[PDB]
Amino acid sequence: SKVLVLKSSILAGYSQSNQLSDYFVEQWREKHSADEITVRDLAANPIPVLDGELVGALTPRQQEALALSDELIAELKAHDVIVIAAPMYNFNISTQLKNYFDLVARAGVTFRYTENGPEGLVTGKKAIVITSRGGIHKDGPTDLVTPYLSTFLGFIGITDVKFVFAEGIAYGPEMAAKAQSDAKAAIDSIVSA
Amino acid sequence: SKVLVLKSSILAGYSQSNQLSDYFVEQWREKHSADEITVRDLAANPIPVLDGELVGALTPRQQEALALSDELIAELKAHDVIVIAAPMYNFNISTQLKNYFDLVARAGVTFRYTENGPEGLVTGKKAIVITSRGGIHKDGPTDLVTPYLSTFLGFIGITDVKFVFAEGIAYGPEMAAKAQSDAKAAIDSIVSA
Ligand SMILES: Cc1cc2nc3c(=O)[nH]c(=O)nc-3n(C[C@H](O)[C@H](O)[C@H](O)COP(=O)(O)O)c2cc1C
Ligand SMILES: Cc1cc2nc3c(=O)[nH]c(=O)nc-3n(C[C@H](O)[C@H](O)[C@H](O)COP(=O)(O)O)c2cc1C
Numbered sequence: 001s002k003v004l005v006l007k008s009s010i011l012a013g014y015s016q017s018n019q020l021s022d023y024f025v026e027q028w029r030e031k032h033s034a035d036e037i038t039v040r041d042l043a044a045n046p047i048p049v050l051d052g053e054l055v056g057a058l059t060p061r062q063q064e065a066l067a068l069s070d071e072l073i074a075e076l077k078a079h080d081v082i083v084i085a086a087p088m089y090n091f092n093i094s095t096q097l098k099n100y101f102d103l104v105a106r107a108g109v110t111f112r113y114t115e116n117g118p119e120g121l122v123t124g125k126k127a128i129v130i131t132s133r134g135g136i137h138k139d140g141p142t143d144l145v146t147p148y149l150s151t152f153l154g155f156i157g158i159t160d161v162k163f164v165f166a167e168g169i170a171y172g173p174e175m176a177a178k179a180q181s182d183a184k185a186a187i188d189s190i191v192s193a
Numbered sequence: 194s195k196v197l198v199l200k201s202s203i204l205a206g207y208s209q210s211n212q213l214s215d216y217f218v219e220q221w222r223e224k225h226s227a228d229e230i231t232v233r234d235l236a237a238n239p240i241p242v243l244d245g246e247l248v249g250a251l252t253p254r255q256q257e258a259l260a261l262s263d264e265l266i267a268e269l270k271a272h273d274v275i276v277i278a279a280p281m282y283n284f285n286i287s288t289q290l291k292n293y294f295d296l297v298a299r300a301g302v303t304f305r306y307t308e309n310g311p312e313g314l315v316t317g318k319k320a321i322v323i324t325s326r327g328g329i330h331k332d333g334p335t336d337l338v339t340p341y342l343s344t345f346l347g348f349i350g351i352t353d354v355k356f357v358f359a360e361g362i363a364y365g366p367e368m369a370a371k372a373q374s375d376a377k378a379a380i381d382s383i384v385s386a
Contacts, residue, residue, distance in 0.1 A: 010245040049242060049288045052203040090298045091345050095242045098288055105283045144341040151335050152284050 004079035007041040008097035016132040017085035042096040050102035069103040086131040110156045120157025127161040134170030197272035200234040201290035209325040210278035235289040243295035262296040279324040303349045313350025320354040327363030
């Protein structure tokens with residue numbers, strides 16, 4: 001099997017979600033050792049903002065963007081397990097992750113319109129979302145990130161999604177420790193499945 | 194009173210939300226004619242992506258970004274009625290609007306931490322969200338944009354928010370007409386209040 005890991009934090013080596021993603025990769029290498037793992041850091045290697053010119057896809061800029069979209073989509077379709085690091089910034093996902101989504105959602109490519117509604121074309125995937133927050137939002141009205149990810153990933157065909165939460169990072173060393181340890185335990189559950 | 198209008202579509206003159214925002218401005222000029230109106234187009238004059246360097250705010254780049262944040266925040270606080278055009282792209286708001294939000298949310302400036310929780314510092318505002326969608330999501334599970342806007346605006350102090358929907362734009366000329374006419378009627382209700 002092939003694992004794709006998508007990093008999206010702007011906090012680099014101090015990122016909670018990157019730390020957890022790195023733990024996931026270490027554990028996967030140990031316990032599913034046949035598997036190939038690809039790590040794409042959407043902060044280290046940013047994806048452009050979808051603007052009028054890019055959606056309008058040609059200008060050299062439009063051709064580059066189309067090529068990139070194509071690369072990202074081919075990479076997504078080429079992996080079996082998709083790990084998405086989704087830190088919350090201002091009640092949204094990071095813009096780094098969003099830009100990725102805006103180039104991967106493409107009619108006729110990652111979803112198609114049918115008589116019954118749109119249907120996703122990225123099928124047979126298993127996703128794991130590692131989502132870090134300073135506060136505590138899980139199962140509450142201020143967590144729009146979780147249902148949005150479920151909705152967006154479902155739309156492109158990725159309906160099997162497991163969420164790993166690291167919440168309360170901002171509430172002191174103990175709460176932060178608890179967030180890390182609970183997330184690592186959830187990851188270990190998944191890895192050993 | 195002073196009106197701030199924030200445009201965020203990438204579709205320029207073909208934007209449904211910009212058309213509706215322009216209708217709002219025309220009607221406000223007619224019916225609340227003392228009032229000053231400022232229009233900021235976040236697509237025509239884009240706000241940078243919040244990245245590690247910008248949040249880390251100094252480098253010339255950090256100083257520029259801080260100055261811009263300051264300008265945007267002062268403009269927000271200087272207006273009484275805030276009209277936010279919020280087209281939905283891939284189940285999110287536009288990145289153009291998001292970048293704006295990422296520079297306006299600032300501890301000690303647009304919200305403060307208190308014993309009782311964070312509290313918004315942008316007070317006494319009335320907001321109108323004009324939100325356009327190709328499909329139909331209102332009061333359903335795939336509308337995360339609405340609660341996210343309520344949540345984000347509430348966090349900075351803007352708790353009085355009225356939503357104007359233009360849905361089903363993608364479902365033919367009649368549905369699109371209905372979206373426009375229903376949104377214009379809602380706008381007329383607000384304007385005549
Ligand atoms: C720009 C910025 C905005 C943030 N806004 C939120 C917020 O809306 N909700 C919250 O619970 N935490 C907020 N936080 C805290 C982050 O969620 C927390 O630091 C988390 O660990 C981020 O993941 P990371 O360390 O992988 O980047 C914010 C942090 C940053 C840098
Ligand atoms: C990049 C892109 C993504 C879109 N994704 C969605 C979607 O998630 N939900 C939906 O209902 N409509 C979707 N649409 C349709 C827009 O919501 C619709 O065209 C609306 O009129 C946009 O407002 P605007 O004309 O002001 O830009 C999308 C349109 C674009 C350009």
